[PDB]
Every structure is written in C-alpha cells, then in structure tokens.
Design a protein around this motif. Sequence first.
Motif, PDB file in Angstrom:
ATOM      1  N   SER A  91      -3.393  -0.120  -7.823  1.00 39.44           N
ATOM      2  CA  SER A  91      -1.981  -0.367  -7.556  1.00 39.44           C
ATOM      3  C   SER A  91      -1.813  -1.299  -6.364  1.00 39.44           C
ATOM      4  N   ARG A  92      -2.632  -1.107  -5.327  1.00 40.26           N
ATOM      5  CA  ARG A  92      -2.579  -1.995  -4.172  1.00 40.26           C
ATOM      6  C   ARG A  92      -3.288  -3.316  -4.446  1.00 40.26           C
ATOM      7  N   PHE A  93      -4.376  -3.288  -5.213  1.00 43.86           N
ATOM      8  CA  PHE A  93      -5.168  -4.483  -5.503  1.00 43.86           C
ATOM      9  C   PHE A  93      -5.474  -4.526  -6.992  1.00 43.86           C
ATOM     10  N   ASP A 112      -4.460   2.147   4.896  1.00 46.94           N
ATOM     11  CA  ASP A 112      -5.032   0.843   4.588  1.00 46.94           C
ATOM     12  C   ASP A 112      -6.530   0.844   4.861  1.00 46.94           C
ATOM     13  N   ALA A 164       5.211  -5.322  -3.789  1.00 45.66           N
ATOM     14  CA  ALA A 164       4.202  -6.374  -3.845  1.00 45.66           C
ATOM     15  C   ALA A 164       4.072  -6.966  -5.244  1.00 45.66           C
ATOM     16  N   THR A 200      -2.438   7.579   2.268  1.00 48.38           N
ATOM     17  CA  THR A 200      -1.988   6.210   2.016  1.00 48.38           C
ATOM     18  C   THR A 200      -2.378   5.274   3.161  1.00 48.38           C
ATOM     19  N   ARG A 215       4.540  -4.952  -8.431  1.00 49.46           N
ATOM     20  CA  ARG A 215       4.934  -3.551  -8.400  1.00 49.46           C
ATOM     21  C   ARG A 215       6.439  -3.418  -8.200  1.00 49.46           C
ATOM     22  N   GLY A 268       5.315   0.456 -10.321  1.00 46.00           N
ATOM     23  CA  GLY A 268       4.281   0.965  -9.434  1.00 46.00           C
ATOM     24  C   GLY A 268       4.273   2.479  -9.347  1.00 46.00           C
ATOM     25  N   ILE A 294      -4.794   4.304  -6.753  1.00 50.50           N
ATOM     26  CA  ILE A 294      -4.169   3.720  -5.570  1.00 50.50           C
ATOM     27  C   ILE A 294      -4.747   2.339  -5.283  1.00 50.50           C
ATOM     28  N   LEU A 295      -6.055   2.168  -5.487  1.00 52.21           N
ATOM     29  CA  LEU A 295      -6.684   0.888  -5.184  1.00 52.21           C
ATOM     30  C   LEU A 295      -6.242  -0.190  -6.167  1.00 52.21           C
TER      31      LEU A 295
END
Lengths: 99, 233, 771, 50
Positions: free
Chosen positions: B37-39, B6, C137, B4, C140, C73, B34-35
């Motif tokens: 979900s983050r972006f 950055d 965020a 996880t 999520r 999320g 994951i990408l």
Amino acid sequence: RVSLFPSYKLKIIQGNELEPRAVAALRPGMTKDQVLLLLGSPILRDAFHTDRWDYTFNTSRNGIIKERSNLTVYFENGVLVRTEGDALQNAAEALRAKQ
Amino acid sequence: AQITQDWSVEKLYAEAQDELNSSNYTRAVKLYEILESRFPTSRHARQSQLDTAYAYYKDDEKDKALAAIERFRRLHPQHPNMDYALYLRGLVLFNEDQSFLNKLASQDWSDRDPKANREAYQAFAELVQRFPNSKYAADATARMVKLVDALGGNEMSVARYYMKRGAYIAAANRAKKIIGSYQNTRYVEESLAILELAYKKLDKPQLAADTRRVLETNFPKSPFLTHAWQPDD
Amino acid sequence: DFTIQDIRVEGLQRTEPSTVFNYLPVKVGDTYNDTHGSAIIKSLYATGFFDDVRVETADGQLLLTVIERPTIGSLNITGAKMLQNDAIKKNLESFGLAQSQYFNQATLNQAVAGLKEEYLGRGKLNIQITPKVTKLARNRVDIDITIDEGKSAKITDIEFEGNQVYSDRKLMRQMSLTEGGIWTWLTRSDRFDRQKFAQDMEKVTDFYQNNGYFDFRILDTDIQTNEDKTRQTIKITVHEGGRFRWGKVSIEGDTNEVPKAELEKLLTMKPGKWYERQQMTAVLGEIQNRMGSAGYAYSEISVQPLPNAGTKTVDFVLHIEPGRKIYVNEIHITGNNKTRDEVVRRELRQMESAPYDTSKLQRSKERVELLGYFDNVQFDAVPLAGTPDKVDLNMSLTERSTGSLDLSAGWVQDTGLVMSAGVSQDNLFGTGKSAALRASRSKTTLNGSLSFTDPYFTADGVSLGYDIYGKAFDPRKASTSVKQYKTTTAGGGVRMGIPVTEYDRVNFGLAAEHLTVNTYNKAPKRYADFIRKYGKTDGADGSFKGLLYKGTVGWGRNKTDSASWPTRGYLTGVNAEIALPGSKLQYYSATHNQTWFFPLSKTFTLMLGGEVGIAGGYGRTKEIPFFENFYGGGLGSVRGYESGTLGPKVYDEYGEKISYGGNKKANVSAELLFPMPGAKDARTVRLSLFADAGSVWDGRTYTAAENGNNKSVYSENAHKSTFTNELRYSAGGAVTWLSPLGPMKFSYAYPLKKKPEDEIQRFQFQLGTTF
Amino acid sequence: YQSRSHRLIKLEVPPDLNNPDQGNLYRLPAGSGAVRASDLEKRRTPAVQQ
C-alpha cells in the motif's frame, strides 16, 4: 463379527423396478431409443456383452435374497429381436388380475 | 494498524519473514499489505502477495488462500514466479491437513474425498502442462500418480462396502465403472473378481463365465481364480 | 491495414507494462486495420485496470497514452447505530473495495445505493449518506461512510376496512405488530419493517383463510407517513367472500403402482369446521410425500376449486399426473475430510440403484445428522445426461471438530469444589471407535474412567465397547452429615447394544465390579446388623470385601429439538441394574423416566416430569444394602429442602440426625419455562417456577433408635413419610443461566407441608457439572 | 498369494466381447512414465535478489 446375533433389525435393499403394463407393449422389431423411452433405462448393462439390457429386482436382507424377478432383452443390428425371462409371465398375470 | 512506522522495504520484508518464522500469521498478514500500500511499485509487493497466501496455507483456512492465489494469478500472469502460484494452489486445494495430532504416517489417502482430490489432480495437471521443466516437476508427477491411485482406492472402497451388504446390483455397476474408466491403477484384477461374484450372486451364469474368462486371459496367475472373492477386515 | 511491431505503452505507475502487454489479444506480426480497435479497450476496461486509453496508428509504433485507475487504500467506517460498523464493512466488502482493488466510482455508487435501500427497509427513513473522497499518495484513495440514523419509526394507528364479519380488536391483537402503549416501549415493539409487514400480511391472510373465509381479496396497502417523515400510520383495506363448506374432495388420475384406495384413505377431510386451509396444505404435502416413496420423484399434483355459490360450498378434484419413475444411479459424498467414507455409507439409507423414495431419504438425512460429527447436511438431486429415469444424490458435508480436551470445574451447594478432567475423542482418526478418558475429583467424590466403544461391531450395527472405573464415595464431610459409610468400587464390563427397530435401540451391559465398604465409629441400627451379618469387625470398626458380578438392561430415546432451550419433544428411558447371583449381595433395581414437553405458547413452554424406581430384594439377602439404596430429596428431585433428608430419620450417637433412604421412589415435576422478555430473545437465560412432589419408602416401621425417636407419634409407620402416596409439596421460582462455563441453576423454592423434622433449605444453587 | 502389487496392465480381451475401453480417465502420463521424486521443503521463495 463371527456368529452373528439375532438382532432383528436389517435394512431392506432393492435393485430395480419396472412397470408391468408397459412390458406387454414390447413388440419384436423395436429400435433402441423407442424401447428405452417406453420401458426404462436398464440398471445393469455390462460392457462385455454390450447388447444385453437387463432389469432385475431383489429385496435382500443379510445376503438371503427374498424375492426376485429378472427381465432380459437382446439386441442386434440396432433392433429388438427377442426377449426372455420370467418377467413376461408374471407381468401378464398381474395385468389380467388388476385390469 | 497500530504502529504504522516509516522504514525501508528491505527491513519490512525482513521483519515480515522473521515474524513468519516465529509462527506469527494473524499479525503477519496485517503487516504484509502495508508495504504494498505504501510502495506498490516494488518486487517486495509481489513477494508479499505470495507469502501472504503461503501463510494462509500454513493455517487451517483455505478460502482466503484460494482468494489470494487467484488474485495473484489474475494480477501478474507473466511473473517468473508463476510456478510457485500453481504449486501452492495445488497444495492448498489438496487439503494437506498438516497436523501432528492426526499424523497417521500410512495415510492411504482413500478417505479424504473425491472432490478435493480431483481438483488437486486438475491443478497439478495444469502445472505440469504449463511448466514441463521447472525447479520442481517430478514431485508434481509423484503427487499426481499418488492422487490418481487414491481416487482408484476410493472407488474400490465404495465398491467393496456394497458387497458386504447384499446390494450386488450396485457393486456390479461400480466395478464396471472401475474396469472401464480406471485403468493405470492397481484395482483391475480385483474389480473383475468382484464383478464375477456379483453376477454369480444374481443367477446370471453366462455373465459370470464371460467375465471369469476375461479375468483368466488377462491374468493367468491370480488367487481369485481358485478362491472366490472374500471381503477382508 | 497495419502490422504490429513491438508497440510501446506509456502512462502507468505500478501496472508492470509486461502484464498489460500480455493482456493485449494481439502481438507482433498481425494485420489490423480497424478490427480490434475497440477490442483492446473492451478487454482493458474489463478486469478493472484503467479508465481511459488512446490508441492510434503511426510508423509501426502506436502511441498508447493511458491514465491509471484510482485505488481504495483503506476503508473507513463510522456512524453505525442500529447496525455494527464491522457488519457494514463486511457486506460492503462483499461488493469489493478491498485493499486498493482498482477502485471504481460506479461500484461505490452502487454500494451506497444498496446500503441506503437496506437502511430504508429498516425503521430508518431520513438517513444522510456522505461518502467522502480524498487524494492520498500516488493512487491511494480513502472512503469514509457516515450514517445519520434517526430515533425510530413507531406506528400510531393500525386499522382495517370492510371488517363487517370480524372485530378489529382481535385483528390488531392477532397481527405481529402492535401500537404504542405502556408495556410497548420495551424491546422496541413498534418499529416498522418491510419484511416484518409482509410476514404480518401472510399471517393475517392465513388467519382469515384458516377460519373458513375464502379468496380474501386483499385490495391494497396504504402507508401514510407524517411531517418530517418520523411517524408512520398504516391503513389496510380488504374484502371477504363469505364462508363455505368444502366436503367433496376427490382424486383422479393414473396411479400405475400406488393403489387409489391407499391415497383415498390419506385424503383426510370432513365437511365440518367449514374448513381449515392449513389442513389442505398438510394433506397436499402428505400426498406428495406418499407418491414419491414408490419412486415418483417428479410427480406434479394440480388442484382446481369448483365453487358453488348459493349453497356456499366448493368441491375439490385432484388431477394427479405422475411419471418417469426415478432411480438413483450414483450418490457421491463431498467434504468428507478427517473421516472415513464408509462411516457415512454405513448409516445413510437409499442404498443404491433403488427407486427414489423421499420417505427414506428424510430418515437418511436425520440419521446422518444424529452422529454429531457434522453440522450441515443437504441432499441435492441433479439429473444426468441420460435424464430418463436417472438422477444423482451428491451429498454435502461440513466437517466440525470432534476431538477435544475436557477440563471443567464447578461448585455444589454443600461440598463445594469439584474437578473434572480427561481427554475426549469421538473419532480415533478412523471409523467411529470413540475412546474417552475421564477422571473427576471433589472433597467427597472421586471416580476415574477409561472408556472405549465401537459403534459398528457387526455389519448392520452393534455398539460394543469396554470401560474401567474406580469410583469411590465417602460423605464424611461438611455440615450435611449424610449417613456415615465409606465405599470404594473398581472393575470393568462389556457393554453391548442391539438395535431392534429403526427408532428404538436397547443396550445390554454386563460388568464385574469389586467393592469394599468401610464403616466408622459406632454405627446406627441399620448398619451394625449388616456389618455383623456380612462384614468383619476390626476393633471399634469394620469393613467388607466382595465381588459384584452384575448385569444391566437399558433403553433410552430422545426427540427434543435441541439440548438446551427445549421445545416439543420428550425424553424417555428405562433402566434396570440386576446383580446376577454367583457373588454376594443379590439385589436388583429398576428405574423409569419421563419428561413430556408441551409448547402451548410462543414463549411459555411446559414440562411434565416423572420417574419411578424400585429396588427389590431377592436371592440370599432379604434386605437391601444401604449403599445401594435410593436418596430422596434434592435439587433435581424436589427442588425444595436439602438433599438426603427424605425417608426415615433416626437418631445416632451425640444426638444427631441421619437418613437411610427407601427403595420405593417416585416424583412428578411441572414448571412454566420461558426466557426473559425484557431486553430481547437472547438465547442465554431461561426462567421457570418449580412445582414438584417427591417420594421414598421402605415399607417397614421404625420405633427403636438411640433411646430417642425423631417422630411425633410413638409408632410412626415408616412405610410412608406422610399420608397415602408419601410426598412433600414444594413451590418456588427457578432461574437458569446457560453460559458455556457450566450451567447456572438458581432455584429458590418455598416449602409446603413442612413437618417439624424435615431440614429445610429454601435456596438452592448449582454451579458446574458435579456429575 | 499373488494379489496386486502395482502391476499396470491394459485390459486385453478375447474376440466377440466388445472391449470396454471407453478411454481412460485421470490420465496418468505422469508427464512421461510416472517417475518418483523426493522432498526439499519447496513451499517458499525468498527472491531477495535472484
């Protein structure tokens, strides 16, 4: 595969069956839907002689057809005109014997 | 989830594709979502949604591949890469069975099933109807004609097996089905012959004469006229 | 009215406004006054995209103000005690809430309600559910589940009412639910479950009505909890109706093709025993299975009781009304990947276009499943648009991997390390045509093998194949000094099967084997004579070479419900190896096999072993070669003393003890097999106690040896090892572990009738395959 | 020896035989005339900037 052995175990196969009593109910001048509902769906019906609903039966065992009984019926103008086949005779005999 | 860390979406995509190149699938799919979900707002999210289904296709499982491809179909119905979705769905549903253990380069394709073959044909038909001119359409048509030939071969094989048992009453019906609904294939001038043989083997001379007349007027030069039909192998 | 002209939408983050534009059922150039004012919000609310949209009409550009829908999320799981967190995660994902999945609160509420109801169905009563929502965020959100399980819900008292005719003790001992005691703390045998209680109610009503008491009007079920809702007390009230005597069953109706007398004979019943309702269910199933083989699939049978009080009896009439004889128009096959279509058409019954007969379709399904290629097989029956007389039988296959690589090892009680290697294949990417390679190696055994068969040689069926083996055997090894002789075999042979009936299937086998036997330093009495009658001496040793043209007739059937952990069913086999004349060593040997099972208990099961074998002499040689003799005693044979110690025993050089073996073998086995009832019913270990005899005989008598006889009496008749029907009793426990890394068989047996010469081994173990 | 060698021929028929057309199934327009193709390993789309 040539010169088969006397392995006396061969599956019996059938082709179709028909009720004997309902055969006597056939009358000339019958419509297609009513005769289909009364006697049964034909198992063999070519697309080259549309009108030729057929019913057969063959207890087969390695090619050798043991017993058979066929019933045919011809249609024109959407109405029954005539039938043929040895099924009528044996059906009448079985109806006279049982009943 | 164990690292996880950055990073930048570009290096995430690079790591993902280079892990895919190294035959890594179990860890890849877990590093694909994951990408997004983050972006979520990124083209890399859609690229991930595609290559995860691609990686699922690269493995034996297909239900998850179908789920992912349907997710993409329902999610972005207007993305320019929609062609890849239909083609990937077709290949997955075709059951390619990619494995060198059973290569069998011949692969007559008459053995898999009617179900998956029919569904793959439907998928490729939808593809060619949606995008008649894309980066790959001739391959779709080639696979489509191959699949219809395989369906014809399956029908012919089922018809042939019954003729080696005596149940001519069934070979007749199956050959009639092939004759009346399976044109454009190669099994036409043989279905007529096997139907003639089945009709003759049941004491129906008029039927056999008529079907043989049809055969001779539709094929003036065929070995089935002189030599009666004979099951091979 | 209004005409749409490139309406602009605002208020989204990741929804790609082009997509939501495409989802609008309207576009530029449409007349819309108020028609689809709600159709847009109905289409958008569907497929799970947003939760609140505003649409108006203003100067050709409608202001579309949208708010997005939260996204789950990542799901968090913990607190699972009676169940597993992964399982609850899976059956919660079955309701959705996967990665960001446009999360909705109503779905979460439905899921938590469902899981709460499921947990309440178990022995959990007061459970705290706390799903927490957090704001990560942009969209999520994370959901965590916490399950606060209590200890358990044990039952205190189980009692009935209106039990004037039956004693309550047998009732509570008959139900599948007991009360707290001393041996009840284990396995948690006092938990309360809804489905378990329902099954118990069905069990008790079956118990009442099978015994001959009728209509069993179950009044009501009375559950009673305690303070804090931790303990539960059950109360049941019932009502009987007195016994009856049902003896006048009858059948009436149209039976167009099936004769009435044939069905009447199937209606087995007697006015005695008051009744047995399960017998009525059985005869109903039988009359539904018989009528349904002539071609009556949709035959519905009705039953109506004619009760007669006073005399306490009820009579039965059966108004059977069949019709619409059912054919089979076409039978499809799906899921047939990696395997040919003919290999399935070649086995199943109900060929085509024939009357639909269930008594044949069941045999079909049993035949297809007995192939080992497939795991799950079903036979549906879907009607056709020509519903009169026509149905379809589309199959369903679950392809299981067939080919694999075999490489295992094990350990035997005396020799030790054993190997086993060789590729295996049940389908050479075509028809059956199974081919298999196998080569094992031990400190005393070595036997390679290349096998290739062909299930269907002819059209119906003939299992033809070929094989090549190089078996070699030499017991010059550790402490157990079995008679000294080295043997090496090689050669192949055609094996051919020939089914005689649907169930039984014999198989003939011819083979041409080359054999060489080698002796060692000075041999016992039973070896020098043979090596000087047939072999050629080489100094202080000798050997022999020849050919072994031989035949083999065999027959074996098996109807156990499973390979491991057996039940009702029985293995049986007959074997016979005859060395056809033309070559040396004319001998023949028969064999038998019987392992009758008996499931006389839900946990305890029985097994009735037994086998008989004779190896007679014929042709040129009057005796029997020792290397083809029988070796009595061993783990599978007697479970007691060491193997190869039965039969006659003679002295050799250096005052040692060996054993020849005789050509009259037999033994009867019997155990009491059941798993461990301590923890649960885990299908991993089974336990038993051994109780089995043995036998081996030659007929002659032995008195001349290496100057010393190992028998008490000077003229011990070697025709038996003891009194009539020579045997050696044995008894002892049997521990069996069936992990996939080879079976574990731990058998500790105490001997009986221990003679002062039979070498004993009270502890025997097996590890691996050691085939 | 003149067996089938991928010869697409529509079933003609003499009169008084009620041609068994019934329409064809699994249409083989192959879009147009059932043309062939080759391989390029098209099972992935980079789409980095394109």
